[PDB]
Enzyme design. Structure first.
Site, PDB file in Angstrom:
ATOM      1  N   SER A  62       0.767  -1.244   0.000  1.00  0.00           N
ATOM      2  CA  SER A  62       0.000   0.000   0.000  1.00  0.00           C
ATOM      3  C   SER A  62       0.794   1.289   0.000  1.00  0.00           C
ATOM      4  CB  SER A  62      -0.955   0.026   1.173  1.00  0.00           C
ATOM      5  OG  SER A  62      -1.915  -0.970   0.994  1.00  0.00           O
ATOM      6  N   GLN A 112     -10.875  -5.244  -0.756  1.00  0.00           N
ATOM      7  CA  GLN A 112     -10.251  -5.849  -1.918  1.00  0.00           C
ATOM      8  C   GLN A 112     -11.232  -5.903  -3.056  1.00  0.00           C
ATOM      9  OE1 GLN A 112     -10.618  -8.053   0.986  1.00  0.00           O
ATOM     10  NE2 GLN A 112      -8.534  -8.377   1.787  1.00  0.00           N
TER      11      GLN A 112
END
Ligand SMILES: O=C(O)c1cccs1
Ligand SMILES: O=C(O)c1cccs1
Ligand SMILES: O=C(O)c1cccs1
Ligand SMILES: O=C(O)c1cccs1
Ligand SMILES: O=C(O)c1cccs1
Ligand SMILES: O=C(O)c1cccs1
EC number: 3.5.2.6
Length: 358
Positions: free
Chosen positions: A61, A117
């Site tokens: 990330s 997700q």
């Protein structure tokens, strides 16, 4: 290096590696426009390849900071506006829940509860439309922050549409090339596989799996040197020659929402400096839980504040990453490891290092 930097780094990271059983690690301390690099252990345990300054780590990330800055660059180029409805850039997104949902919301996890997700079963463009069309928000837009790869991922794909480029091509030509990030990749080329560390999850060598919107959300791989150069670019954006990039960097560190002591940027997250590190280690913003948090709109957004702790954490199955910097002090840190380990431990180490040097 300065002994003080040598000493605090080794004294903080050596125990960290032992306690967490990290196979290999790379650290950069960036201080007054100068980087200092440290490496430990193994990129590849089986082939006894050491971690070097050219080792590639999966950023996870921390990739979102690039996405944030790429989107901020597209804004500075007049291609997109954060106030634009999502449907402007994706008119086939006709489901009524998308009315009121802006590019700001996607970029800052405030669209109303987009999921963490993109499902693995999403592969085609048609699948991706289907997935977003069928999502039912939990909340009205701009009321709660919930961290989501599917939120900022979509922001990344839509932000580049008017340019004419693929996300990858936009990122390479508009961010990587200009900043001379020549060993930073969305797709690791065959030529660089020798430098690509294996991640270790449960003692098995692993690499991140392909998925919808992976480049935009968690797919960048980089070396400690390029990551230090990224921290320096974000520490001193006014040193950057390309005007829309310099401006994009400032847009990405602007403060759009507040929750508790944290401010949401584009990719980057910020606290006011000096910081009490308790919220980011122990409390509400330590990233252990997936947390739905009401947000306060910063109207209008505050321009990038020099007295900030600016940071982002990242993981893949095999890797754990952290970057933090304090523009006011011209001070930053990058920590890259080939094992996913608890975020609080990452932030604790970073704090100890920068609090000692600042
Ligand atoms: O008020 C609204 O837009 C919504 C409430 C719950 C989901 S969306
Ligand atoms: O590569 C470089 O020159 C630098 C990385 C971080 C500060 S300067
Ligand atoms: O920013 C957040 O809330 C999170 C990052 C990773 C898991 S939760
Ligand atoms: O400080 C405040 O008013 C708020 C923080 C988060 C929602 S409202
Ligand atoms: O130099 C400045 O004003 C800034 C550097 C990073 C955010 S603002
Ligand atoms: O395969 C992996 O490690 C990941 C896929 C999505 C986030 S991390």
């Amino acid at each position: 290096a300065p002994q003080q930097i040598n000493d605090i780094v080794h004294r903080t990271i050596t125990p960290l590696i032992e306690q967490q059983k990290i196979p290999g690690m790379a650290v950069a301390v960036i201080y007054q426009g100068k980087p200092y690099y440290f490496t430990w252990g193994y990129a590849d345990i089986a082939k006894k390849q050491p971690v070097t300054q050219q080792t590639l780590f999966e950023l996870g990330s921390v990739s979102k900071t690039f996405t944030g800055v790429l989107g901020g660059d597209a804004i500075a180029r007049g291609e997109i506006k954060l106030s634009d409805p999502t449907t402007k850039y994706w008119p086939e997104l006709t489901a009524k829940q998308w009315n009121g949902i802006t590019l700001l919301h996607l970029a800052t996890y405030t669209a109303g509860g987009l999921p963490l997700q993109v499902p693995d079963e999403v592969k085609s463009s048609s699948d991706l439309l289907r997935f977003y069309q069928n999502w039912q928000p939990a909340w009205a837009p701009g009321t709660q922050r919930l961290y989501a790869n599917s939120s900022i991922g979509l922001f990344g794909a839509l932000a580049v549409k008017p340019s004419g480029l693929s996300f990858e091509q936009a990122m390479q030509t508009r961010v990587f090339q200009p900043l001379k990030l020549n060993h930073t990749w969305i797709n690791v080329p065959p030529a660089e596989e020798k430098n690509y560390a294996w991640g270790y999850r449960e003692g098995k060598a692993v690499h991140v799996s392909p998925g919808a919107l992976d480049a935009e959300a968690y797919g960048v791989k980089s070396t400690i040197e390029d990551m230090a150069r990224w921290v320096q670019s974000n520490l001193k954006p006014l040193d950057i020659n390309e005007k829309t990039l310099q401006q994009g960097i400032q847009l990405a560190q602007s403060r759009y929402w507040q929750t508790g002591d944290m401010y949401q940027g584009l990719g980057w997250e910020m606290l006011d400096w000096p910081v009490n590190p308790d919220s980011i280690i122990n409390g509400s913003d330590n990233k252990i839980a997936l947390a739905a948090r009401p947000v306060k709109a910063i109207t209008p957004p505050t321009p990038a504040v020099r007295a900030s702790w600016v940071h982002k954490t990242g993981a893949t199955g095999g890797f754990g990453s952290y970057v933090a910097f304090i523009p006011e002090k011209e001070l930053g840190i990058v920590m890259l490891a080939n094992k996913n380990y608890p975020n609080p431990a990452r932030v604790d180490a970073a704090w100890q290092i920068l609090n000692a040097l600042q």
